[PDB]
Amino acid sequence: LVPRGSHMVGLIWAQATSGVIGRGGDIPWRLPEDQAHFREITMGHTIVMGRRTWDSLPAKVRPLPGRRNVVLSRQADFMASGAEVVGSLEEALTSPETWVIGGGQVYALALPYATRCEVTEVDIGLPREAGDALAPVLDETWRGETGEWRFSRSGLRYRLYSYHRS
Ligand SMILES: NC(=O)c1ccc[n+]([C@@H]2O[C@H](COP(=O)([O-])OP(=O)(O)OC[C@H]3O[C@@H](n4cnc5c(N)ncnc54)[C@H](OP(=O)(O)O)[C@@H]3O)[C@@H](O)[C@H]2O)c1
Ligand SMILES: CCc1nc(N)nc(N)c1OCCCOc1ccccc1CCS(=O)(=O)N(C)C
Ligand SMILES: [Br-]
Ligand SMILES: [Br-]
Ligand SMILES: [Br-]
Ligand SMILES: [Br-]
């Protein structure tokens, strides 16, 4: 439960075991169960994304429905119809509940304010490569539960972590 006067900042991402979350401006796998999970967590809340993550969303679909979409960019004239564009992270974090939904740069910026991380680990052995977007590594202040590996319908194995801190 979030009191309406507070500011709960959460991060939600899917990563390969290695930490890779993005490559060539795309997520380098597809996992429908994780798409559904991402919706269940974020629906009804503000979502904050960096400009490159906005670009990675299909044009017809963005802004993602049922959520207040916020795009972080330093480009004053950036066009993101249906979203709002802000030039600093702190300006993006005024709602009672906010989910930061990527990418690599914006997770790293937001982590100091965050008290929840909802992580999907994908059992794909993509090694970290030059130019990849990477997930944060959570330090010892973060704690929580680790789910069991399961086969998705597609065959790709995954497990869910729900972590938090004070
Ligand atoms: N697997 C997952 O869960 C997941 C989720 C989301 C995204 N992704 C992937 O991650 C990749 C994108 O990540 P990324 O790290 O390259 O980019 P990003 O974090 O999505 O976006 C970076 C952009 O955000 C803006 N920005 C960054 N810091 C800022 C600040 N302090 N103030 C204002 N604006 C700021 C800048 O926009 P301007 O250049 O316009 O100024 C910057 O170029 C893609 O491959 C995407 O598909 C993966
Ligand atoms: C489902 C991926 C995902 N999962 C987790 N757990 N956290 C994230 N932040 C997260 O990213 C959501 C925002 C980026 O979405 C992208 C980006 C590039 C390529 C594909 C997708 C999937 C979009 S979607 O299928 O879910 N949809 C139509 C909006
Ligand atoms: Br990338
Ligand atoms: Br996906
Ligand atoms: Br959607
Ligand atoms: Br499937």
UniProtKB/Swiss-Prot annotation:
Q: Name one GO cellular component term.
A: cytosol
Q: Which GO terms describe its molecular function?
A: dihydrofolate reductase activity; NADP binding; NADP+ binding
Family to which this protein belongs: Belongs to the dihydrofolate reductase family.
Instruction: Tell me what controls its activity.
Output: Inhibited by isoniazid metabolites. The prodrug isoniazid is metabolized to isoniazid-NADP adducts that inhibit the enzyme at subnanomolar concentration.
DHFR domain sequence ranges = 8-165
Q: What is the name listed in the Swiss-Prot or TrEMBL entry for this protein?
A: Dihydrofolate reductase
* Keyword Lipid metabolism part of the UniProt annotation: no
Q: What is its EC number?
A: 1.5.1.3
The UniProt catalytic activity note for this protein reads:
(6S)-5,6,7,8-tetrahydrofolate + NADP(+) = 7,8-dihydrofolate + NADPH + H(+)
For the biological process aspect of GO, one term held by this record is: folic acid metabolic process
Q: What keywords is this UniProt entry annotated with?
A: NADP, One-carbon metabolism, Oxidoreductase
Which residues make up the binding site for NADP(+)?
A: 13-14, 21-26, 50-53, 72-75, 87, 101-106
Q: Where along this sequence does the record place binding of substrate?
A: 12-14, 34, 39, 67, 107, 120
Task performed by this protein: Key enzyme in folate metabolism. Catalyzes an essential reaction for de novo glycine and purine synthesis, and for DNA precursor synthesis.
UniProt-listed InterPro entries: DHFR, DHFR-like_dom_sf, DHFR_CS, DHFR_dom
Q: Which PROSITE patterns match?
A: DHFR_1, DHFR_2
* Pathway listed: Cofactor biosynthesis; tetrahydrofolate biosynthesis; 5,6,7,8-tetrahydrofolate from 7,8-dihydrofolate: step 1/1
Q: What is the lineage of its organism?
A: Bacteria, Bacillati, Actinomycetota, Actinomycetes, Mycobacteriales
